[PDB]
UniProtKB/Swiss-Prot annotation, chains A, B:
Cysteines paired by S-S bonds: C5-C67
A Gene Ontology term for the protein's cellular component: extracellular region
Top-level lineage group: Eukaryota
Keywords: Disulfide bond, Protease inhibitor, Secreted, Serine protease inhibitor, Signal
Temperature dependence: Stable to heat treatment. Retains 33% of activity when heated to 100 degrees Celsius for 10 minutes at pH 7.5.
Principal cellular location given in the protein's record: secreted
Organism: Aspergillus fumigatus (strain ATCC MYA-4609 / CBS 101355 / FGSC A1100 / Af293) (Neosartorya fumigata)
Stated name of the protein: Elastase inhibitor AFUEI
Protein task: Elastase inhibitor. Non-competitive inhibitor of A.fumigatus elastase with a Ki of 1.6 nM. Inhibits the fibrinogenase and collagenase activities of A.fumigatus elastase. Inhibitor of A.flavus elastase and human leukocyte elastase, and weakly inhibits porcine pancreatic elastase. Does not inhibit elastase from P.aeruginosa or C.atrox venom.
A GO MF label: serine-type endopeptidase inhibitor activity
UniProt subcellular location: Secreted
Chain segments annotated as coiled-coil in the UniProt record: none
Length: 68, 68
């Protein structure tokens, strides 16, 4: 669902910035599927409105989020 | 520049979904840099809060936008 995905990403971007990506925060996110983007990752772009992407830094801290 | 990046993305998501990506919409986006994402594009992921991304489909139609 693109709608619940967007709610999820908005929650992450507004509330969990700087926290480590743990199983706990992963479990709290209800939509599928989830993709964690790390710096350097080679990605083949294919747009999917239902996939939640969580960007973390090299210390596994959450820096951003969006659906795609 | 993340403030102006975000205002642009909000604008394209509100007014331009479903429309072709033209020189008109590009002239309309003062932000630097602008990244147009296409199906199949291979990318090295690096989160840049000031970069505006315009997601286009295979019909060169705008489907979304986000800063990263």
């Amino acid at each position: 669902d693109p709608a619940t995905c967007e709610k999820e990403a908005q929650f992450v971007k507004q509330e969990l910035i700087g926290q480590p990506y743990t199983d706990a925060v992963a479990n709290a996110l209800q939509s599928n599927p989830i993709r964690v983007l790390h710096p350097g990752d080679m990605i083949t772009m294919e747009y999917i409105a239902s996939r939640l992407n969580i960007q973390v830094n090299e210390n596994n801290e959450i820096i951003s989020a969006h659906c795609a």
